[PDB]
Design a protein around this ligand. Structure first.
Ligand SMILES: CCCCC/C=C\C/C=C\C/C=C\C/C=C\CCCC(=O)O
Length: 270
């Protein structure tokens, strides 16, 4: 006559496998070199960037002399990835107990502050020390190539690789990551929330599910739960810094149009 926390953890996991196009197993199959059909195109320099664009995002480079600068095209593709992950996170959040019972405005606020923290947590799954999967698993862009871009665009991805190398060393699987993403979304201290009390109870419940799951799934790492609490705080700081860089790009790079959904996420955020 009590809550079945193991069942809730499995529900969350299954919602994550249903709603995200990429998961850690899918990414590892690709990254291993086992994709015998449509393997990822390796983007390690300008020649291979431009080849990959012509095949994978042809419309973006179909403008001749009017095509935007490479770095701006890359930033545009980064934004398209975020817009898609935001859509996936919004549907995933319906699986979190209590989330769909909140007022619509509180659901919006929780997603507004939580999406980029979740984005950078899950981005770790497509990153290794050399590069990252992009374009629905059809490209692999190298870490060194992204570092080679002109300022400020070379400064976007490196802090996310730094976060990801340490996050990946925790050896989480998708059952853990799904619950960590749910816990990110359920933070009662986001600015502007109306029903803080109910959100705090939603947070306590999902963090309880997370804690018990990590205890079972990672008996070898008794500090994994507090490590993940710290990672949540690190992600908040990573997002604050990322938003600051995006604002520099907005002020100083006239061609780097911000998609309106992301502009709304960033507006009044930090
Ligand atoms: C062939 C098309 C792809 C070529 C490679 C170009 C770009 C890399 C694509 C995706 C990179 C993945 C995630 C983006 C990371 C951070 C979001 C920054 C934009 C934002 O603040 O939302």
């Amino acid at each position: 006559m009590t809550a079945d926390l193991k069942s809730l953890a499995k529900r969350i996991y299954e919602a994550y496998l249903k709603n995200f196009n990429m998961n850690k197993v899918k990414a590892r199959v690709i990254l291993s070199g086992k994709a015998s059909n449509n393997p990822p195109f390796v983007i390690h320099d300008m020649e291979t960037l431009c080849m990959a664009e012509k095949t994978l995002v042809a419309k973006l480079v179909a403008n001749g002399i009017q095509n935007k600068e490479a770095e701006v095209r890359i930033f545009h593709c980064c934004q398209c990835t975020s817009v898609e992950t935001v859509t996936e996170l919004t549907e995933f959040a319906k699986a979190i107990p209590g989330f769909a019972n909140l007022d619509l405005n509180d659901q919006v606020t929780l997603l507004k502050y939580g999406v980029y923290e979740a984005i950078f947590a899950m981005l770790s799954s497509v990153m290794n020390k050399d590069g990252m999967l992009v374009a629905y698993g059809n490209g692999f862009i190298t870490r060194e190539f992204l570092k080679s871009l002109r300022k400020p665009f070379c400064d976007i991805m490196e802090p996310k690789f730094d976060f990801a190398m340490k996050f990946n060393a925790l050896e989480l699987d998708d059952s853990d990551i799904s619950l960590f993403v749910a816990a990110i979304i359920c933070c009662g201290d986001r600015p502007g929330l109306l029903n803080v009390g109910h959100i705090e109870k939603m947070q306590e419940g999902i963090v309880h599910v997370l804690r018990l799951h990590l205890q079972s799934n990672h008996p070898d790492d008794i500090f994994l739960f507090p490590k993940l609490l710290q990672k949540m705080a690190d992600l908040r700081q990573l997002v604050t810094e990322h938003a600051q860089l995006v604002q520099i790009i907005k002020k100083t790079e006239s061609d780097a149009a911000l998609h309106p959904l992301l502009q709304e996420i960033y507006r009044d955020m930090y």
